[PDB]
């Protein structure tokens, strides 16, 4: 039951410090060093530094000497990393990870916290149904989620009850807004007699939308 629980996605504006947290459970917190690792697309994995929770001794990668501050709260078995004066270079997934007691390896990892450093405005998506035109063994429908910021959105089909035959495509950023889409394929006799609905949530804008895919007609 060894776990590291990381905080949710953060949006911060440039210059505004960000603090992320990593709650340990299922082990004796003070006995193990906690490390932090940065991951950006194209830039692999970068070690930020490490902290000994027993007496808060820390060591940082010189690359991050003026950027990252590592602390622990022994009473709540939580490690924190704070990033001073963030820039877009600080946008990344940050992992906390515990080092093995005996060996030089990382033996448990958190799920990562995605940090976006941007001056862009939080914006709600528009969710649009994709139905085929007027008029095979199967039919493909879709859902276009256009124009949101920041990530993420979550998208399901029929509340999660339709999970096979789905491709949800990674978002793409264009001019400060993201767009994502999803396809679902069902037997040709399934729809439109059985309803198919796209459910989209964008937590940042407190957006939750259900969009029924309706057949097109004259």
């Amino acid at each position: 039951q060894v776990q590291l629980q990381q905080s949710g996605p953060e949006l911060v504006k440039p210059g505004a410090s960000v603090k992320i947290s990593c709650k340990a459970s299922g082990y004796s917190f003070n006995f193990y060093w906690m490390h932090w690792v940065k991951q950006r697309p194209g830039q692999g994995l970068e070690w930020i530094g490490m902290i000994d929770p027993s007496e808060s001794e820390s060591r940082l990668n010189q690359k991050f000497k003026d950027k990252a501050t590592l602390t622990v709260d022994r009473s709540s078995s939580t490690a924190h990393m704070q990033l001073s004066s963030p820039t877009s270079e600080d946008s990344a997934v940050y992992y906390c990870t515990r080092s093995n007691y005996r060996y030089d390896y990382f033996d448990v990892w958190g799920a990562g916290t995605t940090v976006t450093v941007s001056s862009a405005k939080t914006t709600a998506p528009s969710v649009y149904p994709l139905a085929p035109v007027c008029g095979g063994s199967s039919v493909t429908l879709g859902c276009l989620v256009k124009g949101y910021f920041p990530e993420p959105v979550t998208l399901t089909w029929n509340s999660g009850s339709l999970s096979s035959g789905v491709h949800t495509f990674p978002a793409v950023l264009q001019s400060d807004l993201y767009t994502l889409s999803s396809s679902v394929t069902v037997t040709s006799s399934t729809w439109p007699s059985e309803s198919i609905t796209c459910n989209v949530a964008h937590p940042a804008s407190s957006t939750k939308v259900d969009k029924k895919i309706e057949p097109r007609g004259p």
Partner: protein
Amino acid sequence: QIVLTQSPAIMSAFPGESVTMTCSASSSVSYMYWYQQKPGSSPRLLIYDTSNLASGVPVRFSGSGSGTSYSLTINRLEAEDGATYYCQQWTSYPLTFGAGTKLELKRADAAPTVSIFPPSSEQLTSGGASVVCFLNNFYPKDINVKWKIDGSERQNGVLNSWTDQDSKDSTYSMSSTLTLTKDEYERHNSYTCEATHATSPIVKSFNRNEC
């Protein structure tokens, strides 16, 4: 400041093949460690102290090496093994990783299933118009999608997105979205998305407002 250099950057192989990837260190290291990162999850320890398999790692994985030259071998690759693999050194601080080898899978060539979708009524009320095409379950990854409006190629305003390789069937899927103004959409008739690789293209089209 031990720099780890991994090669190749990207590779692919059929299931059953033996694959080897290398990690060269700028100065001598005592041991090499190897981490596996499947798309969308955290890195996981695969091999520690050069050749010892981590708990639960199957026998197809091995690690070897010494000094400045190390390698990871997968003997009889499996479809599930698609991941980026990183070496890592703990000989000197700062701790460093290599830039990774992204390993993907080969399978039989497969044509995409292509579906085209006109702008929704909802989007048209906002004054915008997106045309979407899905190219689903194809192989290899490097497919070309081409849009045509009244038979002229349109390159401007096209947004493409690929899924990670499917971990079960080794296909890719992609979504292509062409965004126009409503005004521009309403002054043209035919919309076409065409998928090509090597020979006959797969073409899906519709004519605006012809129901």
